[PDB]
Amino acid sequence: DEDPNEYNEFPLRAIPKEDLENMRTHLLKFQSKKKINPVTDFHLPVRLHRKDYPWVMEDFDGYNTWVGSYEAGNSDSYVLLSVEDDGSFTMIPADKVYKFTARNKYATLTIDEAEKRMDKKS
């Protein structure tokens, strides 16, 4: 109909073909239950390493580690939309989505011993 109203429309740059990380824009997802807070003095550092490939995420020692696994695909796909200072949007396709994928921990000096006790059970 007629537009008595105003719309703010931004130009979308359908994905720029040539980007430095054009190849990789990925999603790292954490479950809310994990309660990971990026703003942590502790979580100032973080390392992301391929485990030889699930990704391994670790803070300084004494902190939790997470494992990242890749989710299955579909017909639709996800794009990351970022906005420049100028309103224009640049979109980038998500290369892969990973669900992380960390530790607990409190899994040391156990597991193998608990199973054995369980066996001392039958």
């Binding site: 719309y7 740059r13 100032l44 973080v46 390392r47 992301l48 017909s75």
Partner: protein
């Protein structure tokens, strides 16, 4: 840089995650990089928040059809985007502030 390190999300940069239909993405690939690959535009309408996506005329010869977007919640999850460059440096680019699905039209 520091090898194996992750970069800077601390800046709290926000980004949007949008689900697009495969056919639309296919069309988008067509756009020339040289052009800057301007696929089309996003419209934000008031009188309630409505967001739609429309393809550029160049993309197809017809009347551009708007693709409505369904806004969705973050869900009980925190989504962050990390990028890996050719250099293989890893950076924590931003957090997903809003999620949306572009419906097919």
């Amino acid at each position: 840089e520091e090898s194996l390190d992750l970069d800077l999300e601390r800046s709290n940069r926000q980004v949007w995650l949008v689900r697009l239909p495969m056919f639309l993405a296919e069309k988008w690939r067509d756009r020339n990089n040289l052009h800057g690959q301007e696929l089309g535009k996003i419209r934000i309408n008031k009188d309630g928040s409505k967001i739609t996506l429309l393809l550029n005329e160049n993309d197809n010869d017809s009347i551009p059809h708007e693709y409505d977007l369904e806004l969705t919640k973050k869900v009980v999850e925190n989504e962050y985007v990390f990028t890996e460059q050719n250099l293989k440096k890893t950076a924590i680019v931003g957090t997903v502030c809003h999620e949306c699905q572009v419906m097919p039209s």
